Amino acid sequence: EVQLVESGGGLIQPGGSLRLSCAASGFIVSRNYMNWVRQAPGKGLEWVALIYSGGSTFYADSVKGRFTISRDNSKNTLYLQMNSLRAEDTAVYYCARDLVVYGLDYWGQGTLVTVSSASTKGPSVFPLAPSSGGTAALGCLVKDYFPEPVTVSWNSGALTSGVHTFPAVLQSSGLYSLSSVVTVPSSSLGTQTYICNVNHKPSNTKVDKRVEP
Amino acid sequence: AIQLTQSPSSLSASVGDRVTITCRASQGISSHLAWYQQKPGKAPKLLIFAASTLQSGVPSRFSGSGSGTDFTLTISSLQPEDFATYYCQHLNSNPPITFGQGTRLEIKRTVAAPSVFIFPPSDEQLKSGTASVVCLLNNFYPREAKVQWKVDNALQSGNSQESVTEQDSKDSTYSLSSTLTLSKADYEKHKVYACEVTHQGLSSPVTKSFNRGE
Amino acid sequence: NLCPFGEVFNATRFASVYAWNRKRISNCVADYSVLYNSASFSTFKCYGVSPTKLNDLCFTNVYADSFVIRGDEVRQIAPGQTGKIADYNYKLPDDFTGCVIAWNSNNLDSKVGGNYNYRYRLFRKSNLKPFERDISTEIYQAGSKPCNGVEGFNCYFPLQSYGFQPTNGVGYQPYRVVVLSFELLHAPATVCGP
Ligand SMILES: *[C@@H]1O[C@H](CO)[C@@H](O)[C@H](O)[C@H]1NC(C)=O
């Protein structure tokens, strides 16, 4: 029941500024070594910043002078202030608790930071209706959004077997698009409702789409 | 100062095999190395620290060894859920820490052929002014698969995009979606929309099709 | 009445850095110049005073602190530094007056299977004051659940061994450090040069 919960990521114009937060439970951040690590899309892990319980801070060369790591003891929270953001800073940012000789044992879930001049756009959601007593397929088409990410679930999380949510594809328009599909028994098409729950945090778009035969 | 180089960069092996990844440090770091497992979309998970100590809760089929410059991670009996990218880290007690570049591990298994489905554009989308047609290949192995869009038997090219899931953690198969995009105007010029699938598990190509307006 | 420097520099046994050793030097004449150019010393840095000039000064007391760190940490033994050594093991003040002397000891202090006798403090709550020596072995509490002197999750032994192997990169090899401090009080001077 140790958890680190990150927030503050999203879309930011080049040269803009952004503050990430990491809210911890199960340990006291002011008593620990803490790191930010980042992962560019499709690439490896890059260490970013480190704060000591005694208060000393250290930084990767690639962020020196632009980033500041700090903490708030009362809120048990770790911060990453990022100024003068450039395209090469686009990454998922993780906070982690550091037992230096014992490795990085707990990590947040990651928050994606996209540094781009493009506008944010919420998706349109369209049903992929089941065709016409074996195994049916149905789905949701999540179309034309920016930036990543979207989250998709089925029946408010109650349906997970046979779900496939595909990695998004960038379209020549510069907008993302993806599908999420599920296979169910044909005999349940008239008797069970199917709703895909689509959330696009950067546009605060929330959509529940019923997918009827 | 320290560069860490993993080897090989990717690799495939069957359930029950014994797998070994190596990490090579440019100078002697003596035993200050950790191993992490990263599953798609998830944070890295600590497996091994001090080069051979199992992190609490981690299955004992994972073990590490080595010291100085040459280290190894071993999975004694590979499991489907061990599909991941694995990273080594220099456990530096002063900063800089560094990571290796990663080693991608995929599960080998028996050929499975895809179930194919085609979905016509929804009426809601057509009301907007665009039409997408979606073809789904479900639960196949191996990853290589050919999807050909045919529109009134004209092989379409340049107006479709596909996407593949990561390998499944239980059945170790893949799935694929291909999306043909058209304007509503172009969509209404044609009648037979069809999706033709080629895969090692299919004796002959499978085609799924519909006629617009049925 | 020549100064017992051979007792410090040629001591058969050196302290771990968290438990750094201190020697009072008093009532002798110190010929620093033979040390300054010894070239067996990879480090000889002076603060608030000048080398090539030391033999011409007089001091109330001289302290010689000595310990083993890894060569990559020797830069932390200086005023105004940060890091696990300066923050939690051995801390020089801003207005330090004295000299730092260091040298590789891989041949003595490194063992084929690894030497684990030398240790440093990894876990501590805040920074040492200057010239503070913390030798506590209390279990360190990383969460809010107290430890009651058992090791476990969020409950860590605060000291760790270096692990000096002879294959180590030169930055991770053992170095011996001697820190001379020059105390100039309002009393007569007891250490001078020729
Ligand atoms: C330490 O011993 C060496 C070898 O016997 C000697 O050359 C050196 O002068 C000694 N250092 C002292 C006495 O400070």
PDB file of N, CA, C and O in Angstrom, chain A residues 140 151-158 195-199 207-209:
ATOM      1  N   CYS A 140     -15.094   0.460 -30.213  1.00  0.00           N
ATOM      2  CA  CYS A 140     -15.233   1.906 -30.211  1.00  0.00           C
ATOM      3  C   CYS A 140     -14.076   2.479 -31.001  1.00  0.00           C
ATOM      4  O   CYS A 140     -12.944   2.022 -30.857  1.00  0.00           O
ATOM      5  N   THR A 151      -7.664   7.242 -22.197  1.00  0.00           N
ATOM      6  CA  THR A 151      -7.911   5.989 -21.513  1.00  0.00           C
ATOM      7  C   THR A 151      -9.236   5.436 -22.006  1.00  0.00           C
ATOM      8  O   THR A 151     -10.192   6.191 -22.235  1.00  0.00           O
ATOM      9  N   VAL A 152      -9.284   4.122 -22.175  1.00  0.00           N
ATOM     10  CA  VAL A 152     -10.502   3.443 -22.585  1.00  0.00           C
ATOM     11  C   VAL A 152     -10.756   2.287 -21.635  1.00  0.00           C
ATOM     12  O   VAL A 152      -9.846   1.515 -21.330  1.00  0.00           O
ATOM     13  N   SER A 153     -11.997   2.144 -21.199  1.00  0.00           N
ATOM     14  CA  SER A 153     -12.410   0.961 -20.469  1.00  0.00           C
ATOM     15  C   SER A 153     -13.789   0.576 -20.974  1.00  0.00           C
ATOM     16  O   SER A 153     -14.438   1.333 -21.699  1.00  0.00           O
ATOM     17  N   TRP A 154     -14.239  -0.609 -20.574  1.00  0.00           N
ATOM     18  CA  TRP A 154     -15.538  -1.135 -20.964  1.00  0.00           C
ATOM     19  C   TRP A 154     -16.407  -1.384 -19.732  1.00  0.00           C
ATOM     20  O   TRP A 154     -15.966  -2.007 -18.755  1.00  0.00           O
ATOM     21  N   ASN A 155     -17.647  -0.899 -19.794  1.00  0.00           N
ATOM     22  CA  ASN A 155     -18.638  -1.111 -18.753  1.00  0.00           C
ATOM     23  C   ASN A 155     -18.099  -0.660 -17.398  1.00  0.00           C
ATOM     24  O   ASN A 155     -18.205  -1.370 -16.393  1.00  0.00           O
ATOM     25  N   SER A 156     -17.482   0.524 -17.396  1.00  0.00           N
ATOM     26  CA  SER A 156     -16.937   1.135 -16.190  1.00  0.00           C
ATOM     27  C   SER A 156     -15.942   0.216 -15.480  1.00  0.00           C
ATOM     28  O   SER A 156     -15.866   0.190 -14.259  1.00  0.00           O
ATOM     29  N   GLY A 157     -15.149  -0.530 -16.244  1.00  0.00           N
ATOM     30  CA  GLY A 157     -14.143  -1.395 -15.663  1.00  0.00           C
ATOM     31  C   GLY A 157     -14.593  -2.819 -15.410  1.00  0.00           C
ATOM     32  O   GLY A 157     -13.741  -3.689 -15.176  1.00  0.00           O
ATOM     33  N   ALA A 158     -15.899  -3.094 -15.481  1.00  0.00           N
ATOM     34  CA  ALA A 158     -16.410  -4.435 -15.204  1.00  0.00           C
ATOM     35  C   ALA A 158     -16.055  -5.449 -16.281  1.00  0.00           C
ATOM     36  O   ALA A 158     -16.065  -6.652 -15.997  1.00  0.00           O
ATOM     37  N   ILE A 195     -20.671  -0.610 -23.205  1.00  0.00           N
ATOM     38  CA  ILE A 195     -20.413   0.815 -23.157  1.00  0.00           C
ATOM     39  C   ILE A 195     -18.910   0.966 -23.058  1.00  0.00           C
ATOM     40  O   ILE A 195     -18.288   0.360 -22.177  1.00  0.00           O
ATOM     41  N   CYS A 196     -18.311   1.723 -23.974  1.00  0.00           N
ATOM     42  CA  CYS A 196     -16.902   2.041 -23.820  1.00  0.00           C
ATOM     43  C   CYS A 196     -16.809   3.404 -23.162  1.00  0.00           C
ATOM     44  O   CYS A 196     -17.576   4.314 -23.493  1.00  0.00           O
ATOM     45  N   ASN A 197     -15.903   3.517 -22.195  1.00  0.00           N
ATOM     46  CA  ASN A 197     -15.717   4.725 -21.391  1.00  0.00           C
ATOM     47  C   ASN A 197     -14.410   5.345 -21.834  1.00  0.00           C
ATOM     48  O   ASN A 197     -13.342   4.756 -21.639  1.00  0.00           O
ATOM     49  N   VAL A 198     -14.495   6.521 -22.434  1.00  0.00           N
ATOM     50  CA  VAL A 198     -13.355   7.151 -23.066  1.00  0.00           C
ATOM     51  C   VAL A 198     -13.078   8.434 -22.319  1.00  0.00           C
ATOM     52  O   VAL A 198     -13.977   9.263 -22.150  1.00  0.00           O
ATOM     53  N   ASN A 199     -11.833   8.599 -21.888  1.00  0.00           N
ATOM     54  CA  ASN A 199     -11.411   9.780 -21.151  1.00  0.00           C
ATOM     55  C   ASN A 199     -10.168  10.357 -21.815  1.00  0.00           C
ATOM     56  O   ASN A 199      -9.193   9.637 -22.049  1.00  0.00           O
ATOM     57  N   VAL A 207     -16.486  10.625 -22.452  1.00  0.00           N
ATOM     58  CA  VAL A 207     -17.507  10.094 -23.341  1.00  0.00           C
ATOM     59  C   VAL A 207     -17.798   8.661 -22.939  1.00  0.00           C
ATOM     60  O   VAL A 207     -16.877   7.852 -22.793  1.00  0.00           O
ATOM     61  N   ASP A 208     -19.070   8.344 -22.766  1.00  0.00           N
ATOM     62  CA  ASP A 208     -19.516   6.962 -22.636  1.00  0.00           C
ATOM     63  C   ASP A 208     -20.390   6.680 -23.842  1.00  0.00           C
ATOM     64  O   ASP A 208     -21.376   7.390 -24.068  1.00  0.00           O
ATOM     65  N   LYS A 209     -20.021   5.674 -24.630  1.00  0.00           N
ATOM     66  CA  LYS A 209     -20.697   5.398 -25.890  1.00  0.00           C
ATOM     67  C   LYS A 209     -21.289   4.009 -25.816  1.00  0.00           C
ATOM     68  O   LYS A 209     -20.562   3.030 -25.623  1.00  0.00           O
TER      69      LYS A 209
END
